[PDB]
């Protein structure tokens, strides 16, 4: 029985793969929060955004998203104090954005996740290779995806942000041969 390799030390990494990770998720409100955390991947590690997603929710949450889309710019100035997350104004400031736009959209009643992973064609992608390093971190659909986001007037949407989003979600079966079962190394 073995998974993945790279996970050492840290228990945030398996912590969280074991919770997500892998597993398609079609919520929007939880996908949501899965692009916006990651855009703070920018220069951070995918495990700092899990230690500042919880420190996030906890200021973030208390105002309620529907605040976060009609807040205030003092709201955000607030925070660059007080709030035990990363601070820059602007990256905040592109949050309030995210909230904004995201309701716009969801107000037509639109499914917002159901179109961040449709773009695969309604037909979900598969990997086989030997290690998670022959896996690429730019694939077709990251860049058509990455490219649909930025209509939505999302920023923080490069090719690598948009693969974490693709691994976070699930769009993509990673999983190395012998990874407790996997197939397809038949003769």
């Not at 073995?2 to 996908?31: F, M």
């Not at 995210?98 to 990997?127: C, I, K």
Request: aromatic fraction near 10%.
């Amino acid at each position: 029985m073995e998974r993945c390799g790279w996970v050492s030390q840290d228990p945030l990494y398996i912590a969280y793969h074991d919770n997500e990770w892998g597993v398609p998720e079609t919520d929007s409100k939880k996908l949501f929060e899965m692009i916006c955390l990651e855009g703070q991947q920018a220069g951070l590690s995918w495990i700092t955004v899990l230690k500042k997603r919880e420190n996030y929710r906890a200021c973030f949450h208390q105002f309620d998203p529907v605040k976060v889309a009609a807040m205030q710019e003092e709201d955000v100035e607030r925070l660059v104090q007080d709030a035990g997350i990363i601070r820059h104004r602007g990256k905040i400031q592109a949050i309030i954005g995210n909230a904004r736009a995201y309701l716009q959209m969801e107000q037509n009643g639109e499914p917002f996740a159901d179109f961040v992973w449709s773009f695969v064609n309604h037909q979900p992608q598969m990997t086989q290779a030997t290690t998670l390093s022959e896996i690429p971190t730019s694939t077709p659909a990251s860049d058509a995806l990455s490219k649909a986001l930025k209509k939505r007037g999302f920023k923080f949407v490069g090719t690598t942000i948009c693969y974490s989003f693709m691994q976070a979600c699930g769009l993509v079966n990673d999983h190395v041969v012998g990874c407790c079962c996997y197939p397809g190394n038949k003769p």
